[PDB]
Design a protein around this nucleic acid. Structure first.
Lengths: 157, 201, 258, 180
RNA sequence: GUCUAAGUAUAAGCAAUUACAGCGAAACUGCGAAUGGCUCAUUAAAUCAGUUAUCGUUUAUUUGAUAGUAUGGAUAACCGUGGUAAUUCUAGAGCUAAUACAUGCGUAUUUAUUAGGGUGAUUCAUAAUAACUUCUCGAAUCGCACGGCCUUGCGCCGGCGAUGGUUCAUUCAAAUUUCUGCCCUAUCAACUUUCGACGGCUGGGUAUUGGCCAGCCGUGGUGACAACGGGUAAGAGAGGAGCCUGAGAAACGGCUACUACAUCCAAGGAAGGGCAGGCGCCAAAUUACCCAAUCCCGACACGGGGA
């Protein structure tokens, strides 16, 4: 009645478990599960992704969306969306006319898991997943919570 | 004749992009099967790799799952109750996935009375006919089905009110226009108060 | 483009075949079979160019159609289907065979070889995974599926099959500190000896190699091919596959010239 | 009109010139499958009844079945139909085919002999024509020549022969085959 | 277009010494042609180039692994009657067979439940259960040898291939997909939100991922680190509109209407939709010979090739 609702009414893992807990295998055993998964790739599962009773299917610890190879980092432009961050990855471009570098800033967008604890201005590890929309091809994995500022703040990272 | 691709759009910056090619036959989107209840009307639409796709336009029946026992009985469909997408699809009673359909509790209830030995879905007049309810107990069948009669013959009482209605709240998890059938499982408990609460809404 | 063609271009014809720049437009394209484009070597290129045992395709089809030539005991009356890798090719009269190996430069060479040394085959494991019946079977790198192996025999082992049923009579273990052919990278087709393996979570964990004369190169596990422990199964290629310099090896060739 | 009156049992059929549009009045307006006798055609015919099947218009158009409103409707034809050989496979060409109801426009009818009459006709029933190709598989030979199952067909031969002239040596003896 | 001894041959066709059987046009059956190469308004990181990846998708074909299970109706060719001016126009009556369309006293699909070697990790692979589909498969085929046991049983067992077949590979592919690089410019600092502009839930179809699309709301997405506009100095096909085949095509030198012309006619009806050559906007480069090489495709040593 709190997180099951969310204005559009189905919040289930792909393995239904909830109503048939009364079946006499898992309950005299212990198979009463929120869907438990590791992402792998040198990470650790956060505790709200261990037992946190929110349900989303684009979650990398609850759903089936996975990560492969390529790993990314970056700082969030606008945290405030419906669970999607936007990354401004800057880099130093080598202008051959000037024989120099310059700033060139880019914008990603990553689907957010309700597991971790969010900041705006933090340095966020994201990962390549299957394209779950146009711009959201990534997923939020691990936060380095830093006090970096807004648009004025710069670092190639 | 109907398109699917990602290029007939506007950009993430917003400017519409000049299309650089014409439509090629791998970017097709086909017509949805607004599946209705009745006779068996079938398109078989042969798709990529020689793999013919079961297109169910009109259907009658299909087996459902009794989730708290793993029992599967073939069941005739009655009607759509709720869909979180479209009250036009409820308003035409169009079948789809995530559609809760009230169903026939006759094959389920006759596995219940063919197996357990307990009444549900009956009036307090308690009428009864021929004997298969008792047909012959043994000492082994007496201890067996009486030992199963002792505790686990048990129901959510709102589901019991839908045995008295004889028409339960199942959910469709298959899609008809790509599998040729409209099947699902039975909704129990917190989801029963959830979607019966959507009948309340 | 937009579906398969069977026409091969001539300026883009790759290194292993030694095709002429002359004689019209098109080159002998190989069609489908066991291997990819790169390590392929058709009988067209084999018996006409590498052996000079042919004049034209009246003669080559007139050899192939009369059931004298065998590939793993199969008749193989086809021109576009490939010959495999580390190959065993038959001239059964007078008892001789043709193993295809690398040279010391990294391209394929013919060898007349005996019936036993030809009759076993060195074929790499591509995969050991679970199929029907609940058994982990072995997908070879080259042709076949070795069903019911020893259950601890895993990937990257290079197997002495006896070629007759596709059954493991021996395996060479994927190891650090072992001798391996390399087929890819900047230094493809070289006999060497691996000094280390690195893990590389993120794609294609590698090996460091340091040869007989202290030259180091680190190449990936998809192109490494552990060819022998010591145990000289196959014929030795020329110069032990060390691939020294052109000047010093040139002076060694002038020193060993008769 | 001129009639292709067809006889299945003797393999024999004819065309017949039809004078007396009065003899065509009973043949008018009748849809296909209906049965009109030969006694209203001829005084020399009595007892035959005949089934109407087909024929062709003036200027060569054929006849479809079930196509009431009798004019030449340019009917769309698909695979596996009458009055149609496919230009290519799968091809559905709109041709022009006459309706069922017989008006006076028809050139040659095609009729089916149903009931035999009393008058002999030489070229229709009296002359004889057995079929050319005979029973080819084994169980078809069983069903015609009554060989209940322990009989070994091989001695039952439905042969054809060809003798030439100019040679000169022998007759030519040919048996079809026995499958199964 | 296409015939292997290995599909179906009773050609009243050759050519020999009664199941057919050698040669073998006809016809059925299969494969076939996403291309040889054309014409002209263009395509300004959307292509493409590296570079990732499908744990988001299909693959005729290749080769390998492969499956303890619950004596049958036609028709074409053929024989005849033929219709009209007739053009792949075709009719009726009768034949007659296939590896051709079709029958036959565990597995394939979908739904849920449960158990569960690899990988960095999946609900992965894999197994069982309950059913389900208007049920796909587990051969009523062809040729080539002619044999072990000797119940000489019109026996039982017997190999060598050709074709055909559920499932996983493998190649050939096709499809998206990621970090960066477009040529110039501020007489370009505002642009996208129409009826998606970005999320996210539910579906739907797509071979699958995706606002690709519909409810349903939230508030967006980008840009003076140079968005967006402008400047071209680089894919589109008698014509719109729909449709069918296949592994792969919105196939057009394939159907169905409508639109613009135009050919045969017995004036009712029908068939119709190319580049090259010469003259041109007083004349000047062959209307050449071949698939012999190299290479490509088909029942396939023959048959076909504007490279």
């Amino acid at each position: 009645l709190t997180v099951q609702s969310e204005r559009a009414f189905l919040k289930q893992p792909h393995i239904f478990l909830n109503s048939k807990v009364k079946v006499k295998s898992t309950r005299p055993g212990k198979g009463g599960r929120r869907w438990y998964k590791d992402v792998g790739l040198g990470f650790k599962t956060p505790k709200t992704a261990i037992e946190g009773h929110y349900i989303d299917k684009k979650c990398p610890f609850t759903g089936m969306v996975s990560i492969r190879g390529r790993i990314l980092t970056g700082r969030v432009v606008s945290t405030k969306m419906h669970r999607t961050i936007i990354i401004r990855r800057e880099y130093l471009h080598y202008i051959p006319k000037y024989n120099r570098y310059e700033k060139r800033h880019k914008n990603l967008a990553a689907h957010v898991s309700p597991a971790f604890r969010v900041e705006e201005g933090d340095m966020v590890v994201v990962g390549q997943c299957r394209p779950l929309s146009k711009t959201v091809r990534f997923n939020v994995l691990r936060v380095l919570p830093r006090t970096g500022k807004s648009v004025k703040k710069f670092q190639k990272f | 004749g109907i398109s699917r691709d990602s290029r007939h759009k506007r950009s993430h910056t917003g400017a519409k992009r000049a299309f650089y090619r014409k439509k090629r036959a791998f970017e097709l989107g086909r017509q949805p099967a607004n599946t209705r209840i009745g006779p068996k009307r079938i398109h078989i639409v042969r798709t990529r790799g020689g793999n013919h796709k079961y297109r169910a336009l009109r259907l009658d029946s299909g087996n459902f799952a009794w989730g708290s026992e793993g029992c599967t009985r073939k069941t005739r469909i009655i009607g759509v109750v709720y869909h979180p997408s479209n009250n036009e699809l409820v308003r035409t009673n169009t079948l789809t996935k995530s559609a809760v359909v009230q169903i026939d509790a006759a094959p389920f209830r006759q596995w219940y009375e063919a197996h357990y030995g307990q009444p549900l879905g009956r009036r307090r007049q308690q009428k009864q006919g021929q004997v298969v309810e008792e047909v012959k107990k043994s000492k082994s069948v007496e201890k067996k089905q009486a030992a199963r009669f002792a505790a686990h013959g048990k129901v959510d009482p709102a589901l019991e009110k839908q045995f008295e209605a004889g028409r339960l709240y199942a959910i469709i998890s298959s899609r008809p226009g790509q599998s040729g059938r409209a099947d699902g499982y039975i909704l129990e408990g917190e989801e029963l108060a959830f979607y019966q609460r959507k009948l309340h809404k | 483009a937009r579906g398969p063609k069977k026409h091969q271009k001539r300026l883009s014809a790759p290194s292993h075949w030694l095709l002429d720049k002359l004689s019209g437009a098109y080159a002998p394209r190989p069609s489908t079979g066991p291997h990819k484009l790169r390590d392929c070597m058709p009988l067209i290129v084999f018996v006409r160019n590498r052996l000079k045992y042919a004049l034209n395709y009246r003669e080559t089809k007139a050899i192939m159609m009369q059931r004298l030539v065998k590939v793993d005991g199969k008749v193989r009356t086809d021109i576009t289907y490939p010959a495999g890798f580390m190959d065993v090719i038959t001239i059964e009269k007078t008892g001789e065979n043709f193993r295809l190996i690398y040279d010391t430069k990294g391209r394929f060479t013919v060898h007349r070889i005996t019936d036993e040394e030809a009759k076993y085959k060195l074929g790499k494991v591509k995969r050991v995974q679970l199929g029907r019946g609940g058994v982990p079977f072995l997908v070879t790198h080259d042709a076949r599926t070795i069903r019911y192996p020893d259950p601890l025999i895993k990937v990257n082992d290079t197997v002495k099959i006896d070629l007759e049923t596709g059954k493991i009579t021996d395996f060479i273990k994927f190891d650090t500190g072992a001798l391996a052919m390399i087929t890819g990278g900047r230094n493809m087709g070289r006999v060497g000896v691996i000094t280390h393996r690195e893990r590389h979570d993120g794609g294609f964990g590698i090996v460091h190699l340091k040869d007989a004369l202290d030259n180091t190169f680190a190449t990936r596990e998809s192109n490494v091919f552990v060819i022998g422990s010591e145990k000289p199964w196959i014929s030795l290629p020329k110069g032990k596959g060390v691939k020294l310099t052109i000047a010093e090896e040139r002076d060694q060739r002038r020193a060993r010239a008769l | 009109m001129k009639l292709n009156i067809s006889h299945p049992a003797n393999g024999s059929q004819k065309l017949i010139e039809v004078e007396d549009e009065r003899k065509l009045r009973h043949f008018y307006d009748k849809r296909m499958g209906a049965e009109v006798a030969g006694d209203p055609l001829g005084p020399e015919w009595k007892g035959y009844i005949l089934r109407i099947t087909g024929g062709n218009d003036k200027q060569g158009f054929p006849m479809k079945q079930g196509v009431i409103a009798p004019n030449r409707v340019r009917l769309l034809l698909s695979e596996g139909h009458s009055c149609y050989r496919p230009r290519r496979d799968g091809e559905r060409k709109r041709k022009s085919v006459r309706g069922c109801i017989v008006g006076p426009d028809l050139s040659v009818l095609a009729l089916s002999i149903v009931k035999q009459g009393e008058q002999d006709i030489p070229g229709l029933t009296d002359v004889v024509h057995p079929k050319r190709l005979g029973p080819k598989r084994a169980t078809k030979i069983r069903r015609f020549f009554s060989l209940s199952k322990d009989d070994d067909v091989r001695k039952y031969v439905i042969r054809r022969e060809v003798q030439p002239k100019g040679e000169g040596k022998k007759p030519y003896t040919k048996a079809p085959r026995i499958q199964r």
